[PDB]
Amino acid sequence: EDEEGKDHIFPPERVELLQLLAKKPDIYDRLARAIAPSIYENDDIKKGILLQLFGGTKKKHATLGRQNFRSEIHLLLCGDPGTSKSQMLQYVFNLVPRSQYTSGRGSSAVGLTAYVTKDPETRQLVLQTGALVLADNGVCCIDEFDKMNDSTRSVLHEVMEQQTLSIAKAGIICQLNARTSILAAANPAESQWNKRKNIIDNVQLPHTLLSRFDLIFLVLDPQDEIFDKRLASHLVSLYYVTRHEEEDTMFDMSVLRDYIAYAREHLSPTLSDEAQQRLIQAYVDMRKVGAGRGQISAYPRQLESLIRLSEAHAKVRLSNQVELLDVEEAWRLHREALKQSAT
Amino acid sequence: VKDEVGIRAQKLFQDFLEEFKEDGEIKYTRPAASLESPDRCTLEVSFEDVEKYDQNLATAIIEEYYHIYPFLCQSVSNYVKDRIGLKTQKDCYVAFTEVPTRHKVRDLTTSKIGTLIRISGQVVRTHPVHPELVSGVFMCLDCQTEIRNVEQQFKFTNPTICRNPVCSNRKRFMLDVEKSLFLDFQKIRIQETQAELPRGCIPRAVEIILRSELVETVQAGDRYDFTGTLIVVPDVSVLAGVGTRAENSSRHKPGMRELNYRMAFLACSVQATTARFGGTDLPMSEVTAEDMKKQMTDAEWHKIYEMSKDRNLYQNLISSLFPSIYGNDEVKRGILLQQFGGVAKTTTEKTSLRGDINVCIVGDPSTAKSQFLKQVSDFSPRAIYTSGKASSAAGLTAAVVRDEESFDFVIEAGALMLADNGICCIDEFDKMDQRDQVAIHEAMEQQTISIARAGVRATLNARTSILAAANPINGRYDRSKSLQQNIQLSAPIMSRFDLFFILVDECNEVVDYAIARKIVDLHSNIEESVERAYTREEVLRYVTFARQFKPVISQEAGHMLVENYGHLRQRDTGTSGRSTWRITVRQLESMIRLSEAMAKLECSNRVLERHVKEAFRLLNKSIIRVEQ
DNA sequence: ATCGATCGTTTTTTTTTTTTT
DNA sequence: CGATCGAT
Ligand SMILES: Nc1ncnc2c1ncn2[C@@H]1O[C@H](COP(=O)(O)OP(=O)(O)O)[C@@H](O)[C@H]1O
Ligand SMILES: Nc1ncnc2c1ncn2[C@@H]1O[C@H](COP(=O)(O)OP(=O)(O)O)[C@@H](O)[C@H]1O
Incomplete structure (x- = not known):
């Protein structure tokens, strides 16, 4: 539900169960396992989803007035049509608080902003509305990324890299505020990702701007004929019965939903000494990467994302001070999908 | 009569503040004392002070205001009378403030009238001054016409019965535009609060009006705090209002107008906040109440002399605005000269002479060349930034129209173009199309530009400098081709830009770990930044002062900038055999204002040959930096 | 001054061609 | 449906 803040306050009895959930080291996988209603294949990313479920940390910059580094969290899913990215995330539109669902060729750049035209209410025309500035902090499930004109997608550079807007038209001229996190379901110019041609070029984008992203946890068809039958039968029987069971996958009515909700507000991850120093040592070989012909490599924006991931995963477990394990799942998150182009 | 209590109230309010x-x-x-000479008739009053002395007339005030409002003007006149030998020319504009409650477009009913509430929103589709001679003189035709009465109502009616005679009571006299009562307003519209952005319904818009002193100080992109003078609107005709209709059918013994009223809104207070800067005679947080050229222009001389005297403050100030940053220490000293003044001569009708200088950044990827400038929009006044592809070539131009709204063709502004005496830098100078590029090819140098195809005698002008964002072909500075092929760009702009300062990347572990050692004091949430030498307030005030000086050259290096420049082109007599380069007098112009600004640092006039030598050093830096 | 008989009274539309960037 | 205008 929505974000008034005042009309959503929870009782202490629910806090019992919330910190109960927090009392599971199983909680690292429980809510990611409670993401799907019934989908039981290779949820290994749903932990990577969940850092945006628990939608990011608030590293404010009311401190120095300088450099305004939000804990910017940006991840996209990309792969083949087999994956239910559109349908998963059509359902996740029925999850996200600021649920949006547009995609390539639903609305232009001005189809996202400045819906300007006549108004017979005033008997005059007016400067008027947009899309993103309504979705601050939110998400739009998005597909068919490689579909838009260059007019759009050079806006996204602006926001993804500054999270800003300053506008100039003949009528109103504006320097507004706009900022949020991604979900998307980009696709290539192909039907299947071409074997022996990485998404380094398969999806249609430039040389190191492809490299620029934090990490897009790759998707692709499961290359195994066998497992179809299991769920072709189980999740058709799901329809055949037209109801569920509260099995070990205990689907909470709302006990899941306030650990989502309440854990946006009263939490403030802090760093003492834990989740920083590993790559602050290992950067030797992490920046022996200067060598390479036409490649894309390691850069010193990675650790920014690492700290952000870290405070995110400390959001789960509610560790007011730093979590250290978050590093380990961060390194896992990386090198499960950073060796997709060793070539 | 009702409001005589309000009369006595503001009366004895005067009589108290009379003491x-x-x-x-x-x-x-x-x-009011400044008022007494011109008699302009605007005085804001603190609403708190009603609760201080009058003891909660707020609730005596904030409902029956619209009716009580006029009595405040009589009260005002009674104030001005007591000590000034007074005529009744006096009037009452008010720009109320010191009010707590802040409501929005939704709590609207019949019960909301005659208040003083403060409200914000946005500003859109503004509209112009349109005067009003609200009053005049009008009665029967013969002689008995001297009429300064109450005839100024919104609903206007020439027809009056009589004053002295039995005479015409529909046949009027003629009009007075000469010695009578007139005033002004405008009319604009407002959209829903961007601090209150719910779902579903539209941005319900309100009508808005402004009195005299409020005028032409509203503007697009601004939020406000109004009065709460919601209205019965003396409207004239409308459709769809098919409710019951009434009118006075008088006494039987032995004109018509359909009634459907609409809503608008009126206001008599503004604090256009988030749009307020103030130059240097404004007392800041840190001041020194002293005597000076002006009020506070440099009345902190008590320190600014000190901030203009050290031989250390150069480097200290180079380090007093990059606490959270570490890189080379050449742009950290050069880039300020872009923000720092130039030449400012006092000279002939030859042609416009320029103060500003072109400025560049190039570097390898992920070097925080952006973070140099991401802050600069938050830093300087007039100088707001976005990208060039952040808009169209309705950045330079306006949005080109081919439909009829007012006269069917409108390109009269832009986005670069409204940066008068601030810079609006841009990123990504390499892949942008060659339209604004060739526009800038002269718009930076000959800051007096024109267009065709829609021109209302097109003559526009750039005003400030620039910041560049190049990156090489391969993403790396692989020394496998010449610079002219390393960037694949043109000559004259590589000479128009008299200052380059490229930021090259390497791999040495101590550097990167030293950066993470910056990070040691980036999230230590107490002490997440490094020490400094000079607070920002004094910094910008010294900056705001150091221009008003008339910089000068009479120096033998001014005489023998011929010598240093002769050597400049002596050593650059080559730069022609191995990958030829070009020298040009824009370089001299740039060095000139560069040396001049370098002495403007000194809070002093009158250039010194030290500044020439450092400028020569820096030009040598830039040109040998251009060497492959 | 009062009443009554005199005088004079009117408003409704939406869309297609060539032009300019 | 309005104002002019005449006499009673
Ligand atoms: N785990 C799953 N649960 C339900 N449906 C699935 C699952 N995996 C695949 N699908 C099916 O695969 C299809 C995915 O297509 P879709 O993702 O919408 O194409 P695109 O990848 O272009 O968005 C959907 O119709 C969906 O029903
Ligand atoms: N000396 C430094 N001080 C602060 N941040 C730095 C420094 N060097 C590198 N960085 C970081 O490296 C990143 C550089 O990315 P950036 O250069 O903006 O990308 P691009 O190369 O696309 O412009 C920034 O986020 C910045 O925080």
Whole structure:
């Protein structure tokens, strides 16, 4: 539900169960396992989803007035049509608080902003509305990324890299505020990702701007004929019965939903000494990467994302001070999908 | 009569502030004292002070205001009478403030009228001044016409019965535009609060009006705090209002107008906040109440002399605005000269002479060349930034129209173009199309530009400098081709830009770990930044002062900038065999204002040959930096 | 001054061609 | 449906 803040306050009895959930080291996988209603294949990313479920940390910059580094969290899913990215995330539109669902060729750049035209209410025309500035902090499930004109997608550079807007038209001229996190379901110019041609070029984008992203946890068809039958039968029987069971996958009515909700507000991850120093040592070989012909490599924006991931995963477990394990799942998150182009 | 209590109330409010009002002092007599000579008739009054002395007339005020409002003007006149030999020319504009409650477009009913509430929103589709001669003189035709009465109502009616005679009571006299009562307003519209952005419904818009002193100080992109003078609107005709209709059918013994009223809104206070800067005579947080050229222009000389005297403050100030940053220490000293003044001569009708200088950044990827400038929009006034592809070539131009709204063709502004005496830098100078590029090819140098195809005698002008964002072909500085092929760009702009300062990347572990050692004091949430030498307030005030000086050259290096420049082109007599390069007098112009600004640092006039030598050093730096 | 008989009274539309960037 | 205008 929505974000008034005042009309959503929870009782202490629910806090019992919330910190109960927090009392599971199983909680690292429980809510990611409670993401799907019934989908039981290779949820290994749903932990990577969940850092945006628990939608990011608030590293404010009311401190120095300088450099305004939000804990910017940006991840996209990309792969083949087999994956239910559109349908998963059509359902996740029925999850996200600021649920949006547009995609390539639903609305232009001005189809996202400045819906300007006549108004017979005033008997005059007016400067008027947009899309993103309504979705601050939110998400739009998005597909068919490689579909838009260059007019759009050079806006996204602006926001993804500054999270800003300053506008100039003949009528109103504006320097507004706009900022949020991604979900998307980009696709290539192909039907299947071409074997022996990485998404380094398969999806249609430039040389190191492809490299620029934090990490897009790759998707692709499961290359195994066998497992179809299991769920072709189980999740058709799901329809055949037209109801569920509260099995070990205990689907909470709302006990899941306030650990989502309440854990946006009263939490403030802090760093003492834990989740920083590993790559602050290992950067030797992490920046022996200067060598390479036409490649894309390691850069010193990675650790920014690492700290952000870290405070995110400390959001789960509610560790007011730093979590250290978050590093380990961060390194896992990386090198499960950073060796997709060793070539 | 009802409001005689309000009469006596503001009467004895005057009579109290006729004595002291605040510590033997009054806050609303010296505004009135400045009023007394021109008699402009605007004085804001603190709403708190009603609760201070009048003891909660707020609730005596904030409902029956619209009816009580006029009596405040009579009260005002009674104030001005007591000590000034007075005529009734006096009037009452008010720009109320010191009010707590802040409501929005939704709590609207029949019950919301005659209040003073403060409200914000946005500003859109503005509209112009349109005067009003609200009053005049009008009665029967013969002689008995001297009519300064109450005839100024919104609903206007020439027809009056009589004053002295039995005479015409529909046949009127003629009009007075000469010695009577007139005033002004405008009319604009407002969209829903961007601080209150719910789902579903539209941005419900309100009508808005402004009195005299409020005028032409509203503007697009701004939020406000109004009065709460919601209205019965003296409207004239409308459709769809098919409710019951009434009118007075008088006494039987032995004109018509359909009634459907609409809504608008009116207001008599503004604090256009988030749009307020103030130059240097404004007392800041840190001041020194002293005597000076002006009020506070440099009345902190008590320190600014010190901030203009050290031989260390150069490097200290180079380090007093990059606490969270570490890189080379050449742009950290050069880039400020872009923000720092130039030449400012006082000279002939030859042609416009320029003060500003072109400025560049190039570097390898992920070097925080952006973070140099991401802050600069938050830093300087007039100088707001976005990208060039952040808009179209309705960045330079306006949005080109081919439909009829007012006269069917409108390109009269832009986005680069409204940066008058601030810079609006841009990123990504390499892949942008060659339209604004060739526009800038002269718009930076010959800051007097024109267009065709829609021109209302097109003559526009750039005003400030620039910041560049190049990156090489391969993403790396692989020394496998010449610079002219390393960037694949043109000559004259590589000479128009008299200052390059490229930021090259390497791999040495101590560097990167030293950066993470910066990070040691980036999230230590107490002490997440490094020490400094000079607070920002004094910094910008010294900057705001150091221009007003008339910089000068009479120096033998001014005489023998011929010598240093002759050597400049002596050593650059080559730069022609191995990958030839070009020298040009824009370089001299740039060095000139560069040396001049370098002495403007000194809070002093009158250039010194030290500045020439450092400028020569820096030009040598840039040109040998251009060497492959 | 009062009443009554005199005088004079009117408003409704939406869309297609060539032009300019 | 309005104002002019005449006499009673
Ligand atoms: N785990 C799953 N649960 C339900 N449906 C699935 C699952 N995996 C695949 N699908 C099916 O695969 C299809 C995915 O297509 P879709 O993702 O919408 O194409 P695109 O990848 O272009 O968005 C959907 O119709 C969906 O029903
Ligand atoms: N000396 C430094 N001080 C602060 N941040 C730095 C420094 N060097 C590198 N960085 C970081 O490296 C990143 C550089 O990315 P950036 O250069 O903006 O990308 P691009 O190369 O696309 O412009 C920034 O986020 C910045 O925080």
